[PDB]
């Protein structure tokens, strides 16, 4: 239909607009903690500490298959990403420091995506 046509633009577009958020998010990571899962090889009691994991490549995935259908799921995983790392490491760590950071300077970012979103529907 013409209907399912004009929904899949829509969410090609958030896709797109999401993308850019994504980028300007990990950006504020530059020492790239958070750029791959945490390794279960090197850190093999994570699940037992961790039920979901999250980290910026597997939310690129879910994003590029369009698996994001509005803002509140995209920033549900962000929020995944700071929180997880918060619980495991102790404030007095680079990893604890660097979500903190992340979590201060995503805000402005996230602040005016909600508006974006809203603005163009």
Same mark, same amino acid.
């Given at each position: 239909?013409?209907?399912?046509?004009?929904? #899949?633009?829509?969410? =090609?577009?958030? =896709?797109?607009?999401?993308?850019?958020?994504?980028?300007?998010?990990?950006? &504020?990571?530059? !020492?790239? +903690? $958070?750029?791959?899962?945490?390794?279960? *090889?090197?850190?093999?009691?994570?699940?037992? %500490?961790? &039920? %979901?994991?999250?980290?910026?490549? =597997?939310?690129? *995935?879910?994003? #590029?298959?369009? /698996?994001? &259908?509005?803002? %509140?799921? $995209? #920033?549900?995983?962000?929020?995944? +990403?700071?929180?997880?790392?918060? &619980?495991?490491? !102790?404030?007095? =760590?680079? $990893?604890?420091?660097?979500?903190?950071?992340?979590?201060?300077? /995503? /805000?402005?970012?996230?602040?005016?995506?909600?508006?974006?979103?809203?603005? +163009? /529907?």
């Amino acid at each position: 239909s013409m209907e399912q046509v004009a929904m #899949e633009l829509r969410l =090609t577009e958030l =896709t797109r607009l999401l993308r850019s958020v994504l980028d300007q998010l990990q950006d &504020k990571d530059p !020492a790239r +903690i $958070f750029a791959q899962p945490v390794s279960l *090889k090197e850190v093999p009691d994570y699940l037992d %500490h961790i &039920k %979901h994991p999250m980290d910026f490549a =597997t939310m690129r *995935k879910r994003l #590029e298959a369009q /698996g994001y &259908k509005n803002l %509140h799921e $995209f #920033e549900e995983d962000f929020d995944l +990403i700071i929180d997880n790392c918060m &619980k495991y490491n !102790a404030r007095d =760590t680079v $990893f604890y420091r660097a979500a903190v950071r992340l979590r201060d300077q /995503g /805000g402005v970012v996230l602040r005016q995506a909600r508006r974006e979103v809203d603005s +163009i /529907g």
